[PDB]
Amino acid sequence: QSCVWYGECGIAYGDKRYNCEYSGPPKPLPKDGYDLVQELCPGFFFGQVSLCCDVRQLQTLKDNLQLPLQFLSRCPSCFYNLLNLFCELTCSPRQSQFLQVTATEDYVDPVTNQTKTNVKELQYYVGQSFANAMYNACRDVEAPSSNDKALGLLCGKDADACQATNWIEYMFNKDNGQAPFTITPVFSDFPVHGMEPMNNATKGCDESVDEVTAPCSCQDCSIVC
Ligand SMILES: *[C@@H]1O[C@H](CO)[C@@H](O[C@@H]2O[C@H](CO)[C@@H](O)[C@H](O)[C@H]2NC(C)=O)[C@H](O)[C@H]1NC(C)=O
Ligand SMILES: CC(C)CCC[C@@H](C)[C@H]1CC[C@H]2[C@@H]3CC=C4C[C@@H](O)CC[C@]4(C)[C@H]3CC[C@]12C
Ligand SMILES: *[C@@H]1O[C@H](CO)[C@@H](O)[C@H](O)[C@H]1NC(C)=O
Numbered sequence: 362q363s364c365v366w367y368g369e370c371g372i373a374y375g376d377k378r379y380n381c382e383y384s385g386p387p388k389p390l391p392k393d394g395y396d397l398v399q400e401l402c403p404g405f406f407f408g409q410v411s412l413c414c415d416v417r418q419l420q421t422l423k424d425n426l427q428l429p430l431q432f433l434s435r436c437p438s439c440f441y442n443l444l445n446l447f448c449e450l451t452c453s454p455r456q457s458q459f460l461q462v463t464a465t466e467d468y469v470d471p472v473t474n475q476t477k478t479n480v481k482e483l484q485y486y487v488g489q490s491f492a493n494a495m496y497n498a499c500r501d502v503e504a505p506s507s508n509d510k511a512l513g514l515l516c517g518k519d520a521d522a523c524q525a526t527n528w529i530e531y532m533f534n535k536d537n538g539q540a541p542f543t544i545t546p547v548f549s550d551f552p553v554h555g556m557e558p559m560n561n562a563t564k565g566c567d568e569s570v571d572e573v574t575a576p577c578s579c580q581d582c583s584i585v586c
Pocket of ligand 1: 402405407445561
């Protein structure tokens with residue numbers, strides 16, 4: 362197994378950071394990050410919890426999930442697949458299979474003056490079926506106390522123009538003011554020049570995420586009506 366990054370490096374803009382380039386194997390997560398990994402990416406919470414992310418990156422992921430939560434929190438299945446898209450990107454011990462760094466710049470530690478490398482942009486090979494299922498679970502979600510669709514607030518365009526791939530492309534575009542750096546998505550259910558797209562299992566909005574989480578309401582999910 363191999364990573365493309367590990368830990369945070371320099372400022373991108375605002376309070377947002379690039380991650381440090383790293384191409385070695387995943388590393389066991391410190392125990393102080395177990396609460397975060399349980400909360401965000403419980404699918405990875407087993408064995409040595411060897412991941413291609415550190416505690417800082419998990420904390421940053423949690424902070425950055427606030428706006429998706431703002432609009433999608435009422436439909437746990439919809440939010441679940443979205444969290445998984447980000448968990449795999451952030452932490453997967455097999456990152457190198459589906460991520461390709463495309464731009465870097467040097468990072469200089471201000472105290473030791475040791476150089477590291479900011480991952481400035483990367484390409485993310487996302488399963489076509491994954492992306493379609495993620496959109497499918499979210500597409501009827503209503504913005505809280507409204508009759509408009511939640512995706513119209515997370516897609517940089519109205520809901521009637523929002524589609525699976527342009528949604529993911531928008532969320533991954535730092536021009537949105539939220540993403541710290543741009544990720545360019547490539548959608549395929551098939552390998553691409555030896556890259557194996559991320560095609561994790563997904564949950565529909567009519568399914569329970571787990572034993573303690575109900576399916577989404579009829580208002581947010583026309584299947585359950
Ligand atoms: C994406 O899917 C992979 C493959 O199913 C998940 O990895 C498994 O997770 C379960 C639950 O902890 C473990 O029992 C297995 O040992 C894992 N399998 C392998 C082959 O790694 C992974 O959890 C999913 N990703 C996320 C973020 O949930
Ligand atoms: C404007 C709206 C639609 C944006 C909604 C999606 C936001 C929350 C997404 C887009 C890109 C995402 C980021 C992608 C990459 C990383 C690097 C990782 O090591 C820490 C988490 C972090 C920083 C993610 C947090 C969630 C994120 C900021
Ligand atoms: C998702 O796809 C199913 C069929 O797989 C369909 O019934 C439903 O209308 C779609 N949308 C939602 C919100 O689940």
